[model samples]
Target: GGVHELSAFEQLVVELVRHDDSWPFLKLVSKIQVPDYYDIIKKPIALNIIREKVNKCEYKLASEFIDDIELMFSNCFEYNPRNTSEAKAGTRLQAFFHIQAQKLGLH
Candidate 1:
């Protein structure tokens, strides 16, 4: 018995990550390398699609849950210097998301 509430975007992120952990960070890094084509890239494209769907479900939530999303992203990282951590990819994705969110005016 516990609380479980996931926004549409959150659910989308989960699904996307569940299938391939690398997809999220790879997409993000690619975007950084070529910022102009962010919309055409995979990660941003997927995120945009999910965000739009989430927005349709609850507009306020889409706008208000910036921090929650940021935290989720951070949770994916292990913060290790040995460069051998499962969450490292997640950490990178989180950084990218934070940058993307800020640029998009969601944070």
Candidate 2:
């Protein structure tokens, strides 16, 4: 594949993972720490997994990568209530992502 798609995915995620609100999404939730998380969240996603998927070439499309990012945020919002710290972080991260998405000319 060309650099355009792959680079965009990598570059955008680089800054995203560094974002303050990105703490909640840096890795998968801990089973022991949040035992009920897996019980409620049918699907799980994280920046680390996304990074792995990209390196493995499992993610070939930019939009699909974006989809998973959305899933991560949605999972956060769904599992955590509005006033919860996790939900608030997810909301901010989502807004930041959209700004960066358009800034990078992503769809």
Candidate 3:
């Protein structure tokens, strides 16, 4: 019973990934940037989109968006005492996504 719906920010990411809009894709990635670990909160939405693409056999399309999620995680936070939990949570989320992707036989 985690976030069952996409936030506006998450929806923007999906739209950018799906459409060849006039805006640069990097601009969309920037929308998920929060001050710290809170960025992780937006990740599942992106992952869910990737999973759906994979399920549809849209492997190439899904792979393209992987860089977008990676950029979000990298830009989210830095290592520091205050950010430790946030950093760990982001890592765990990434691991969960990877494991699920593998299980689904989507590389």
Candidate 4:
């Protein structure tokens, strides 16, 4: 497969955090809410895509962007065909954090 270039939001986050060193990018993940079945249709796909991009970055500066990252899930499902429940998206992100922490022996 070809390389997937970062999206505009991802690029923005990268730029925002590139110069910061004391931010917790992953912690800000609490902003993302898990999507309900029908609301999944309205969830902002780009947000998740940008999150994946952030997750793939192997540098510490990436955390800075998480400080201000917006979890606009409401906008994501605004156009959903069916009503979806309000779910938070941070659990999976926390898992990622836990895995990364374990790798570094932080816990």
Candidate 5:
């Protein structure tokens, strides 16, 4: 898969954080709500992008992206789908965060 297959949230995250203009990027995420269900599937992918940036020591990008990262997971806690499969996906996404944090010595 490629960027073309990325979900809307992933795409937006890429558009914002792929460059140095993260102040506006930060503002955008701050102003927006969690996306709807169809769009929420992309949030984990976006979160992974932030995690990769952090792991690579891209501190500026990671710092700007962190709030959105937290927002995505917090939304999962606030409004998890009742569907078992989707809920499992959320669990896996949270687990991914933990593993990455451990690997980066941030856990």
Candidate 6:
């Protein structure tokens, strides 16, 4: 038999994308628009980027996906001010990711 889809991880990323608070994490921050965005957030990542990796079957280990998703949220909190609009979006989405990740054995 051939390898199958990462159904669990697939659903996880899908729900993350559809999440109402996920708008801010959908893509990379535009340096041209945001002053010194790259200067602060050197290791920028996003939900869309993670989904791209998933679709490409690039993650070999579950930890790899977890790391990227964690980094995705960490980058947001690091770059933005506490309780800022973008930071809150990432916070809520990160909370959901936590619950779902533990359920999916991604803890």
In model 5, state the lDDT of residue 27. 29
Give the winner by TM-score: 1 or 6: 6
* Index of the highest-lDDT prediction: 2
Q: Model 1, residue 38: displacement in angstroms?
A: 34
Task: Give the clashing residue pairs of candidate 3, or none.
Answer: none
lDDT of 4 by residue, 1-107 (tens): 34343343354544433423213232322334533533433333333454665667633443433332333333332432233222223333334434554454334
Rank by lDDT, descending? 2, 6, 5, 1, 3, 4
Name the regions of candidate 1 deviating beyond 4 angstroms.
1-56, 61-63, 74-84
Query: Highest TM-score, which number?
Result: 2
lDDT of 6 by residue, 1-107 (tens): 34455877888998898889999889897778997888888788988889999999999999888999989888888888777999888788889999988887777
* Model 2 lDDT tens row, 1-107: 56654787787889899899999899998999998999899999999998888777787677889999999988998888999988888889899999998888788
In terms of lDDT, the poorest run of 10 residues in model 3 is 20-29
Task: Name the regions of candidate 3 deviating beyond 4 angstroms.
Answer: 1-60, 77-83
Report the CA-based lDDT of candidate 3 relative to the real structure: 0.45
Writing each residue's lDDT as its tens digit, candidate 1 over 37-63 gives 434332232344445546565545655
Please list the Cα RMSD from the true structure of every candidate, rounded to 1 decimal place: 13.2, 2.3, 12.0, 13.1, 12.0, 2.5
Local accuracy by lDDT, each model = 0.47, 0.88, 0.45, 0.38, 0.47, 0.86
Global fold similarity of model 2 (TM-score): 0.91
- Positional deviation of residue 96's Cα in model 3 after best superposition, in angstroms: 0.6
Q: How close is candidate 4 to the true structure, as a TM-score?
A: 0.22
Residue pairs with backbone atoms closer than 3 Å in model 6 (clashes): none
Residue 85 lDDT (model 5)? 52
